[PDB]
Design a protein around this ligand. Sequence first.
Ligand SMILES: [Mn+2]
Ligand SMILES: [Mn+2]
Lengths: 468, 468
Amino acid sequence: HMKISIIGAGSVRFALQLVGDIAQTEELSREDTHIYMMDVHERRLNASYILARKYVEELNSPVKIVKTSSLDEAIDGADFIINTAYPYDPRYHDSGSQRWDEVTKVGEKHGYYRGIDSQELNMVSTYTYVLSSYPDMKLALEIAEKMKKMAPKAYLMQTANPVFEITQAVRRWTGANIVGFCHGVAGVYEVFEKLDLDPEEVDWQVAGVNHGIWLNRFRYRGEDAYPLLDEWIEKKLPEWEPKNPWDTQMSPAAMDMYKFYGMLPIGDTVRNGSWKYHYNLETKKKWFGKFGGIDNEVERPKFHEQLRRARERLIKLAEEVQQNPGMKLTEEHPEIFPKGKLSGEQHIPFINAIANNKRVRLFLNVENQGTLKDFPDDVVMELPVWVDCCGIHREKVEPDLTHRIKIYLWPRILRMEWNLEAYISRDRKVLEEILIRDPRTKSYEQIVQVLDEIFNLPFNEELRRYYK
Amino acid sequence: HMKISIIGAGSVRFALQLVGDIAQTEELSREDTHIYMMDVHERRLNASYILARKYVEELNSPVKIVKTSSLDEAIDGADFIINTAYPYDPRYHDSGSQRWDEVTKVGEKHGYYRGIDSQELNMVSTYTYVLSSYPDMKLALEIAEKMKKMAPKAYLMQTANPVFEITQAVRRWTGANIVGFCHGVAGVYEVFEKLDLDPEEVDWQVAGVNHGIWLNRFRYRGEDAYPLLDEWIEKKLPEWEPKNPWDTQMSPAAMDMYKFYGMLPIGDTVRNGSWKYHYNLETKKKWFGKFGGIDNEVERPKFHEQLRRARERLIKLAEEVQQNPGMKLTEEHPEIFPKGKLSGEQHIPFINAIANNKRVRLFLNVENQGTLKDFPDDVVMELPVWVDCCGIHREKVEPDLTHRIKIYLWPRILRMEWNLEAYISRDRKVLEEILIRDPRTKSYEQIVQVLDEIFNLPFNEELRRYYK
Ligand SMILES: [Mn+2]
Ligand SMILES: [Mn+2]
């Protein structure tokens, strides 16, 4: 009996990706594989459970799916616990994105463009919440302590953000068996495509911290391939255009960071430059192209609204399924319900590697343990690893990250430490010292005022009591 | 034959302090002690040499004093080399303070209050010059390479700022036998005085980096003494007033840093808080008292002018000496020329410890070497040490610095690394990345403009060619 528990299974698109990958993995598509879907939103949970059951049926997979509103029941004796939950106050909100939208506006009201949580080296929208990410940190630690008692052999597969902060605090403060998951490394394939390189003929590696990873190795036909990037920068960068607001991997910002640091930032790292690329929307469009990227006052509200519409549609689709047993989800909406094709993300390959010894190369957030020698052994970094039934095996990182990149990641590590200290100390003065270092802070009184108004939002009642 | 060479002996007040301490140290006041005074300013050098000779004569000390304008002659076979030189372009300026004054004004012209060199954790005036401190770094390394050849057994006793950056780069890039000197630790005695404690009955220790040191141990009558500070904060802080612009050790800023970090910052560390204490002159007066401290647009120009007047007076006093052999410098100006009393600074005790095994406890900038375990072995820190003829012996630092102070010093260490990278790479883009992290930077174009105008100052011709 293998038990795979999805905490936050109302993330039904992500739930359906995980379910579909399991159902399409021969070693896991068995009667003895039990998938537990747990969520605090009953409508979303029900709808996700109906869609997952019908989906699995159309794939002719015999896995069992169980739904529950009990965190304890989902954790009890689980082999793998995937945390994709995004907490929210149900008295005021329907999903977590809403608390971040509203605090971001408050921040902008007080002169912080894109909110206080948008800082240098961390512009990724929704990554942290009021700096210390209290509700998301709280849930992960609660899961971690429950599983130390109820599931001591389980892996906690952390996907909800902040992955860096949460994986570090869990590891450090509970010793629970937590691993952080992010597929930002998938940006490399955009590089190979733009440079007309067969991905299978490229010898490559990335390393760093979450959303702070760099293409430390890039070789082709027995030689360094970066001169091929240099040629692309000269001849083709002038004509580059993003296909959508998320398309930044080959943007002027990415190449400007590569010029200074010596290696190419990969994936969401490109979103996390200095303020040079982010002072305002016009500056974002200069460095990221027509959309200004995804982390701005136009595109992010547009996207969160798209996700809300999708949640409502999936609830309605679940009702359609109950009314029309004969309909084929894979036929009517083949995008949402793909068939005969794995998603390509790392969660199910990880599970199949640990349990069934299907060895695979992944990029995961684990303790450094001397892999990057100029960083502490206990700091959680995003590293290239091979996973099998004997656990996680860190690759040697070669070539080493450049000196300049090392003194780029150290500040991001220190920001993590200040964020953890702000959480564990319950001390509002720590949040004030974080913002006194913010370039947008003009005065100390500005810091108190913006934090005051944030804490006084009705849905931040628990946060306010935590720091009081 | 012991040879003590003062590079920059035109710092005649500092030269006279060093000369007077030697002349009043029994083990060093000998015929075989040769003091070499070297400086590029002939008038200042001559005047310093005349005053030093007459001074030594009135102390009945037989030490030999030699003046030279040759750096090589001063370094050749020296046992100790004290670097107090402050370079300047003689085509435009008469002393080094002038290049810092003029670049600071340019910075303020472009919206950087107190100049680009005034950054968080480094508000100390004149500490760095255009971030990377090119002329001061250049001289120290030139001395370091000359002495590796001409004086392989010598100690380079670095006193010119930036002490942290220069001691680190010399150690790292040349392996020369450099030790950094700063007496900021003397602030502890202000604490003992305000709290009515006999200094000899206090068990105390400080540690950190240069201008980043903290009173990690403070005990009295077999117990922690910090509760005595707490009582002083409650009953006496409201009525505290600075005696002069340099008096900040017991200021509201110092106590506000102590509240957050858990230990008291000592000496010039109190000048180096966050921008909380430094946004403008009115804010400086709130946190430092009536004068706003010494690092502001009123008090610093007032002080540099006082030093200029003093240089002119000492030149004129030297002429008086030549005209009136019978006058007694110790009688007419006993402040400048004290008798029967050591200065209390660390340079001559250090020399007497190394050469004559007079063991003494000092606070010096040396490689960590595991003393503070959460920092690299090779990073130069300001540490409590015992010095004897067997060299430098680091005390165990106990109690350890607090967690919050550790994540305060790490950013200052990283700033040092960025400053060194800006120097060695000769890359103006590095200075631009430093300022993009500055809270006062509003745009990227602002950075280029302020650096452009700084580099284009006539006296920065060498700096401009270095970075071109
Ligand atoms: Mn991610
Ligand atoms: Mn100093």
